[PDB]
Symmetry: C2
Subunit: 131 residues, 2 copies
C-alpha cells in the first residue's frame, strides 16, 4: 500500500512555497515515501545559470522539513527509467521531455504555491524606509 | 516516559539556525512532545521593536518543520507556572527572570546555532555585483 514519490528540484533559499509543494507531493496518496532529489551545484549553475546556496546547505535545510522522508543529494539532472527502477519510484511529482512519465502513468502534477520568499521579505522590509 | 518540552520565540524569517534549535529542543530526551509557542505581532512589536512576518506566516512556516509536534499561536510573552500546569509542560527549552524555572528543574538550555539567514543570503548574492 505504500507508494514511493520522487520530487526533484534545486530547493535554493527554501521558503513556504517549496514546503507546501513538498506537502502536496507527500500527500498524493494515503501512505507514501517522499524521496526528494537535490540538484548539484555545478549542474544547477550550468543549466539554470546560478545558485545561491551550496548543495550541503540546500540539503541540510530539506532534512528539517516534515514531509521529506528520504533525500538523494546530489540527484541526477534528468530522470531516467533506470533511475525509477533503481529507487523503486512509483510516481514523479512535478510542477514534453516528460511525455514518457505521463505515458507510464507515473506523472503527478503539483501546483506551484504562494510563499513569502526572501525577495518578498526584503521588499516588505524596505517599504518602511523608502517609497 | 514521554516528556513535554516547550520552546517559545518570535520565529521571524525562519532559517536553519532556528530549525537546528528546534531539533535540539525536540531531542533533549528520547521521547518528547515539542510544543512551540509563537509570539503575537503586537507583543513582538512592543517588546522587541519590530517584526517582519505576521503571526499567521510565522506559524504556518513552523507547521512544516519536522521537530514541531504542537504549536501555541499566539503564545504568552512571559511563561508562568500556571501555563506550565495547564499544558502539562515538563521542561522549557531556552537559549534572571528565568531563575524560577531553574530552581524547579524545568530549565533546559539550547545553544544558539549557525544558519544561513536572509541577511547572509543577500550579502552573498550582492558580493557578486559590488565590493
Amino acid at each position: 500500500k505504500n507508494v514511493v514519490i520522487y520530487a526533484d528540484g534545486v530547493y535554493d533559499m527554501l521558503h513556504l512555497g517549496h514546503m507546501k509543494q513538498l506537502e502536496q507531493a507527500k500527500k498524493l496518496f494515503e501512505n507514501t515515501t517522499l524521496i526528494v532529489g537535490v540538484t548539484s551545484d555545478n549542474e544547477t549553475k550550468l543549466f539554470k545559470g546560478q545558485v545561491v546556496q551550496t548543495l550541503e546547505e540546500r540539503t541540510e535545510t530539506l532534512k528539517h522539513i516534515r514531509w521529506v522522508d528520504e533525500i538523494i543529494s546530489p540527484c541526477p539532472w534528468v530522470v531516467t527509467p533506470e533511475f525509477l527502477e533503481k529507487y523503486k519510484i512509483d510516481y514523479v511529482a512535478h510542477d514534453d521531455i516528460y511525455a514518457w512519465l505521463k505515458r507510464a502513468g507515473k506523472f503527478k502534477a503539483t501546483q506551484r504555491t504562494e510563499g513569502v520568499s526572501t525577495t518578498d521579505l526584503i521588499v516588505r522590509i524596505l517599504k518602511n524606509y523608502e517609497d
